Amino acid sequence: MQVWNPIDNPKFETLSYLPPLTDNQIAREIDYMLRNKWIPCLEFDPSGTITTLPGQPGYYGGRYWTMWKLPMFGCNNAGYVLREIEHCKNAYPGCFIRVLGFDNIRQVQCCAFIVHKP
């Protein structure tokens, strides 16, 4: 028998229960979004906590982050998304960073994962 640790063990949603992500396995999740005609984007925030309200169902605080420049409309090669992450990392070396995708026909996001931690 083994015991799961309850102290100082945060998690960050999808893909966060697997071993850490290498640089190769990152440019395989972008070629899957490009093969279905979706639109990449970037975000960053200094904190990651969640707050509530006394008696209002379905209201949570801390779900919006800040957008880097603009969505990349009409992008075909995966070498530009990788270069923009490096520009984002030098300006704010003390924030989290996330990668998103957009489906414009059903109006809903399709992916999300973390690429940098403070």
Partner: protein, 464 residues
């Protein structure tokens, strides 16, 4: 003039050359006449006694127009592989139904014709709802897209678990097995269908002990969590009281059994849940008394399209491999009717008509019943994302506890998602993926060894 007596049914209600309108409801029946009865008199006797008709002539028929208020049979075909079996088509005018009622439609179409002395069997397969009739319903309270945004969860299917034993636990022990499950990796938790309010555990102090575990497990992992609370009751005044106490505590979701509770009580809860911001989960109980046999009853593909009109955000839909009966092609056919906006005719899956929904939101399907970690690659290829997966005894039956038994259910799903979105075959492989994954996780190699040789294989009864 007026002439009293008895007449045949095929002199008014059998019209073989008729062109239908785009404002009509259509139905398809499979029937078996008794010996000595023509296949057309029996067909005309089904349209007559559902709209306007009786066994004799009356004088009040001449005070109104009957060709304007009558139903009529227009097509009959024989089944291949049966001496005496046929399929009949019937059309209904629009001005016969009340706007906003699911009760009236079922009272009219199926209320008296199943028990005639001149028949041996009858089954209803499909219906068509014109866009001019579905615009008078509210529909699902939120939908699929408005529910994925409140919870902030994108890119993978959702996960859950139900609490066991079914009955016999107290109120403080019931909420201690919720915290350990939710803190290990799951998203939801649930009551059983028959846990309402009973001498060993009353309803009001369970709602309070469950709400204390969600807050403690939410501040420890940094993710949003929830639990379905059951609002089924014996009267409406009691069902409305248990829905107002979940709103004061700030809970997101509730439950209801819509076939033993009724269709009138399910359209009031749906209206309440829209005006106050709650989510609704629907459980199909007592559905196999009607749906199981091939030659008598109502198919579930018909009971599915009434829920989408009445209102709901989730629904159970069964599994292909498990302890309960189901078929692959029929399931793949009626999931499409639940999730999509335009569906075409495909007789290889059991669809008789073309259906449009003119922008009504879709519903999420739920798969449950006797499934463990070896079925993971097979349940991801059939349903994909946009679905919910539930393990009740495959979580609480782990040899180490409730929390270790929820890490093995999340690692096995993420390991399959990563392999799928890389270009691998989830049908030929699937054993190798789990076998490779159970090498850096010691909680998966333990669950992989107790349920290694468990399968359910029997014959099927329906067979399309």
């Amino acid at each position: 003039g007026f002439k009293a007596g008895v007449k045949d049914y095929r002199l008014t209600y059998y019209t073989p050359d008729y062109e239908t309108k785009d404002t009509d409801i259509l139905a398809a029946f499979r029937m078996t006449p008794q010996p000595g009865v023509p296949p057309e008199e029996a067909g005309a006797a089904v349209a007559a006694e559902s709209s306007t008709g009786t066994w004799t002539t009356v004088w009040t028929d001449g005070l109104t127009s009957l060709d304007r208020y009558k139903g009529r049979c227009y097509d009959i075909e024989p089944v291949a592989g049966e001496e005496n079996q046929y399929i009949a088509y019937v059309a209904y005018p629009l001005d016969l139904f009340e706007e906003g009622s699911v009760t009236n439609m079922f009272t009219s179409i199926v209320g008296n014709v199943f028990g005639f002395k001149a028949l041996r069997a009858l089954r209803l397969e499909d219906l068509r709802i014109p866009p001019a009739y579905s615009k008078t319903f509210q529909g699902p309270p939120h939908g699929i897209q408005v529910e994925r945004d409140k919870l902030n969860k994108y890119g993978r299917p959702l996960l859950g678990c139900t609490i066991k034993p079914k009955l016999g636990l107290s109120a403080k022990n019931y909420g201690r097995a919720v915290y350990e499950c939710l803190r290990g990796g799951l998203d939801f938790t649930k009551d059983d269908e028959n846990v309402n309010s009973q001498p060993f555990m009353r309803w009001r102090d369970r709602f309070l002990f469950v709400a204390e575990a969600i807050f403690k497990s939410q501040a420890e992992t940094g993710e949003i969590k929830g639990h379905y609370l059951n609002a089924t009751a014996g009267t409406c005044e009691e069902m409305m009281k248990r829905a107002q106490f979940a709103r004061e505590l700030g809970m997101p979701i509730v439950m209801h059994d819509y076939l033993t509770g009724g269709f009138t009580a399910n359209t009031t809860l749906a209206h309440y849940c829209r005006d106050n911001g709650l989510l609704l989960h629907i459980h199909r109980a007592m559905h196999a008394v009607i749906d199981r046999q091939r030659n008598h009853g109502i198919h579930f593909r018909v009971l599915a399209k009434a829920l989408r009109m009445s209102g709901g955000d989730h629904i159970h839909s069964g599994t292909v491999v498990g302890k309960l009966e189901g078929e692959r092609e029929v399931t793949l056919g009626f999931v499409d009717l639940l999730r999509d906006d335009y569906i075409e005719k495909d007789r290889s899956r059991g669809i008789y008509f073309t259906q449009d929904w003119v922008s009504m939101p879709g519903v999420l399907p739920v798969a449950s019943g006797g499934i463990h970690v070896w079925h993971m690659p097979a349940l991801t290829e059939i349903f994909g994302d946009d679905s919910v997966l539930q393990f009740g005894g495959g979580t609480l039956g782990h040899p180490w506890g409730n929390a270790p038994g929820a890490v093995a259910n999340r690692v096995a799903l993420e390991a399959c998602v990563q392999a799928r979105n890389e270009g691998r075959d989830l049908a030929r492989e699937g054993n190798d993926i789990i076998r490779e994954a159970s090498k850096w996780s010691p909680e998966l190699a333990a669950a992989c060894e107790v349920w290694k040789e468990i399968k359910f294989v029997f014959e099927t009864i329906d067979t399309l």
